Design a binder for this molecule. Structure first.
Ligand code: HEM
Ligand code: HEM
Ligand SMILES: [Mg+2]
Ligand SMILES: [Mg+2]
Lengths: 238, 239
């Protein structure tokens, strides 16, 4: 992996970007196509390995679910992933709920909750991620009459916290903690925080590595389901 | 541009991967998909279904990407992978047994007795008879399968599959919502395009807008109602 051959570039109007900081950051570095188009599961598997040392087990599983969001046979544009109720969910860390705002773009007012978490410490961790999930869900339950909160959205949310905690770690992703200086750049700029001192994990990030972090965040989050608790996903756009 | 003479039916070998879907198994039996049933991608399905049946990309991209969930591979399946229960594969099939009480993969003539003897007095199967068969097959599963799953999603998939055989095996106008029995029976029993019987590829493209009203008509005629867990949750991956 030569990271100097993968410089960050800001997206312009030819560049599709979605609700996922992980994939948007890979596109901003050219590990995925910079235009955010014509993205296949094999391209995601390779880009996640090269950029983040994320292994194929999770990227095939998630990637094939994400492909459902487009109208194309075996590719997406990253913006397609905003399709509500496939993967995209309410009570995001950095986006608004679709019923009451913009479910696509980074939103600093939403991000405030994560940004102010684990106060006095230099890291986010499992405990602070759980508290943020609790507080984000409580915000959606208070303000969004159309909130969807189910076993499946709760699991996806904890997967996403585990992703930022592992991929943006100081080098040992097992530990379930990540420097704030790295995670904040990842979200706010969709940039690998290389200038700040981040490096790609030398440990493969796999389903067995993520699973305990996901389950422990859920356990500490004081979570309950809402409504019919139906794990049905949206299988296609329009 | 399709040359059917270059696509002869050959009986599948015991080692050729085949699934629960007569549409894709027939395409493989004619070499529109690989005859071994392996290494099949959505683009391959789109091309095969266009060439073989005049089924357009909208419906094959939608179905195909859901089918891709049934394998552990990045962008392909084997046909047999599509037997994964609760992705697309469902109870109350027209020609297969429910997985909890039998074989959910192979054509079963005993199960097929219901469809084969439907629309009595006509030489076609139609929207009304397909609806009645869906009612009767679901009633069988509700009676005999203690693990039966019947949701708005499974009911819609079942109507879609009836609409597929009525349109693709039609006597040439798929809008009619009827297909000759002599064609449909070969399609199911042999997973063969009934070319010597007089079947020809539709000259009307079969699309989501074409199918939608047929599917809705089959559903309403089938007298379907929710019975239990009505959550349209699918199985998103093998274990
Ligand atoms: C490659 C490693 C990946 C990392 C590090 C990553 C990270 C993240 C994070 C941290 C979020 C939460 C954003 C928020 O709550 O505001 C998220 C959201 C999302 N990710 Fe990813 N992700 C990755 C891969 C994937 C893949 C493969 C897909 C699908 C192909 C995907 C689809 C999504 C979608 C649709 C959302 C929006 C969910 C929501 O917040 O409503 N991600 N991702
Ligand atoms: C190409 C045109 C297609 C036609 C004409 C067709 C036709 C059918 C029909 C008539 C059945 C019902 C069998 C029964 O109930 O015994 C069926 C089942 C099935 N089809 Fe297809 N199909 C096509 C394409 C597809 C595609 C693209 C996929 C997925 C990639 C697929 C996956 C399935 C599966 C999994 C089943 C089993 C459902 C069940 O009966 O439990 N089909 N198909
Ligand atoms: Mg969201
Ligand atoms: Mg079945």
């Amino acid at each position: 992996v030569d990271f100097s051959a993968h410089p960050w570039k800001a997206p312009g109007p030819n560049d599709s970007r979605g609700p996922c900081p992980g994939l948007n950051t890979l596109a901003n570095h050219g590990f995925l196509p910079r235009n955010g188009r014509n993205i296949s599961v094999p391209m995601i598997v390779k880009a996640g390995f090269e950029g983040y040392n994320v292994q194929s087990d999770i990227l095939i599983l998630a990637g094939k679910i994400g492909m459902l969001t487009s109208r194309e046979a075996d590719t997406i544009s990253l913006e397609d992933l905003k399709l509500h109720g496939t993967i995209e969910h309410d009570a995001s860390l950095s986006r608004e709920d679709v019923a009451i705002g913009d479910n696509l773009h980074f939103n600093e007012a939403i991000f405030t909750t994560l940004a102010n978490s684990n106060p006095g410490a230099d890291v986010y961790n499992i405990s602070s991620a759980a508290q943020v999930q609790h507080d984000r869900l409580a915000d959606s339950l208070a303000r969004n009459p159309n909130v969807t909160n189910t076993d499946l959205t709760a699991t996806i949310r904890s997967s996403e916290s585990a992703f930022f905690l592992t991929v943006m770690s100081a080098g040992d992703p097992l530990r379930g903690e990540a420097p704030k200086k790295f995670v904040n750049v990842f979200f706010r700029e969709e940039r690998m925080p290389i200038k700040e001192g981040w490096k790609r994990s030398t440990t493969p990030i796999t389903i067995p590595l993520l699973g305990p972090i996901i389950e422990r965040i859920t356990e500490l989050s004081d979570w309950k389901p809402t409504g019919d608790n139906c794990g049905a996903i949206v299988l296609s756009p329009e």
